[PDB]
Design an enzyme around this catalytic site. Sequence first.
Site, mmCIF file in Angstrom:
data_model
loop_
_atom_site.group_PDB
_atom_site.id
_atom_site.type_symbol
_atom_site.label_atom_id
_atom_site.label_comp_id
_atom_site.label_asym_id
_atom_site.label_seq_id
_atom_site.Cartn_x
_atom_site.Cartn_y
_atom_site.Cartn_z
ATOM 1 C CD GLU A 33 13.747 4.106 -0.732
ATOM 2 O OE1 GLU A 33 13.324 3.074 -1.292
ATOM 3 O OE2 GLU A 33 14.943 4.233 -0.410
ATOM 4 C CB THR B 161 6.837 3.948 7.674
ATOM 5 O OG1 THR B 161 6.564 5.353 7.593
ATOM 6 C CG2 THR B 161 7.212 3.603 9.107
ATOM 7 C CE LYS C 269 2.284 1.431 -0.607
ATOM 8 N NZ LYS C 269 1.532 2.548 0.015
ATOM 9 C CD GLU D 4 -7.547 1.914 -5.931
ATOM 10 O OE1 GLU D 4 -7.740 2.497 -7.023
ATOM 11 O OE2 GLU D 4 -8.401 1.904 -5.069
ATOM 12 C CG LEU E 258 -4.702 5.760 -7.205
ATOM 13 C CD1 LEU E 258 -4.706 4.522 -6.304
ATOM 14 C CD2 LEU E 258 -5.536 6.895 -6.633
ATOM 15 C CG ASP F 299 1.882 9.083 9.397
ATOM 16 O OD1 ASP F 299 2.054 10.250 9.788
ATOM 17 O OD2 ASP F 299 2.725 8.501 8.679
ATOM 18 N N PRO G 118 0.442 14.542 2.928
ATOM 19 C CG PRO G 118 0.874 16.799 2.307
ATOM 20 C CD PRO G 118 0.838 15.851 3.525
ATOM 21 C CG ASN H 241 0.535 8.348 4.012
ATOM 22 O OD1 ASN H 241 1.354 7.666 3.407
ATOM 23 N ND2 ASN H 241 0.594 8.546 5.318
HETATM 24 C C1 LIG Z 1 2.918 6.461 -8.922
HETATM 25 C C2 LIG Z 1 2.775 6.623 -7.408
HETATM 26 C C3 LIG Z 1 2.180 7.979 -7.027
HETATM 27 N N1 LIG Z 1 1.946 5.559 -6.865
HETATM 28 C C4 LIG Z 1 2.027 5.156 -5.540
HETATM 29 C C5 LIG Z 1 3.025 5.544 -4.658
HETATM 30 C C6 LIG Z 1 2.973 5.074 -3.352
HETATM 31 N N2 LIG Z 1 3.913 5.412 -2.408
HETATM 32 C C7 LIG Z 1 3.739 5.160 -0.988
HETATM 33 C C8 LIG Z 1 5.056 5.421 -0.257
HETATM 34 C C9 LIG Z 1 4.912 5.261 1.241
HETATM 35 C C10 LIG Z 1 3.881 6.243 1.751
HETATM 36 N N3 LIG Z 1 3.784 6.150 3.247
HETATM 37 C C11 LIG Z 1 2.516 5.994 1.102
HETATM 38 C C12 LIG Z 1 2.600 6.032 -0.426
HETATM 39 N N4 LIG Z 1 2.010 4.235 -2.916
HETATM 40 C C13 LIG Z 1 1.051 3.876 -3.771
HETATM 41 C C14 LIG Z 1 -0.067 3.098 -3.634
HETATM 42 C C15 LIG Z 1 -0.453 2.429 -2.448
HETATM 43 N N5 LIG Z 1 -0.766 1.892 -1.479
HETATM 44 C C16 LIG Z 1 -0.690 3.076 -4.885
HETATM 45 N N6 LIG Z 1 -0.003 3.802 -5.778
HETATM 46 N N7 LIG Z 1 1.060 4.302 -5.070
#
Ligand SMILES: CC(C)Nc1cc(N[C@H]2CC[C@H](N)CC2)nc2c(C#N)cnn12
Length: 282
Positions: free
Chosen positions: A12, A14, A33, A73, A75, A119, A122, A124
Amino acid sequence: MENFQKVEKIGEGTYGVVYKARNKLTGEVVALKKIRPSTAIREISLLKELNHPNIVKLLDVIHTENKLYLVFEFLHQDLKKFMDASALTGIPLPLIKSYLFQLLQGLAFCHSHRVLHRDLKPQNLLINTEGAIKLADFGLARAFHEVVTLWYRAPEILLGCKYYSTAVDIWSLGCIFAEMVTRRALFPGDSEIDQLFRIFRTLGTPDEVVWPGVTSMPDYKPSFPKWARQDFSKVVPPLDEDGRSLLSQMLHYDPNKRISAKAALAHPFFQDVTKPVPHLRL
Ligand SMILES: CC(C)Nc1cc(N[C@H]2CC[C@H](N)CC2)nc2c(C#N)cnn12
């Protein structure tokens, strides 16, 4: 959106939900997203241009049928999960060092283009098997319920400065640095005043000596309690002298005094930087 099959919900946010997804026309796997103004359109189109090895790549902006999808991308882990995973043992200092140094490089890039994150936290920060760490959600803040964490927020923000600078990100990252070392949040505020007062209790109530203009800040109160500054040797043991020197520069109250990402890269703490590979199990 039709070109992407969701594989799983990966968090989830913001601004909305994040999915792991597979592009059918590229076969590429990604992070998709879902968000909720043309201003936001133009801002994001800017972001698609700031490409850096330490910034999560924005692959595609999809403004279709009046909803907004950002394709990044993918990760496989973030730093919060890794931290929680490394807790019994702590992240080895050479990896903490490498992570800090890479992030500073990403910041120096963003900031040289006048783009703030605003913002850092960890959650992010995203890591790969190759020892890389990357900033995610860079630029969205200025481009656009579970409580948003205050733990990393710079004091000038908490004191109601409306015109932050790049220094707010240095602050955040310094909070992050301290947390990787100690295995506990530096300043775990659960309201704006608790957050402020935690900063105060550790670094001392700012005044006009250390922070000229602080008493003229919008939410500053002459009635704030006056706490003494603690010793950094108490705050982040057992970080070495170079590490503690650097952290203090990242946590300077006055944002004009606070070290830049670019000056921080030249600090002696990085004399022996290397690029270890983390043990992450996926
Ligand atoms: C497998 C996972 C670690 N990959 C993710 C997670 C993720 N979550 C977001 C949730 C909202 C937060 N404010 C920021 C991280 N976002 C990403 C991205 C991007 N952009 C790429 N891989 N992941």
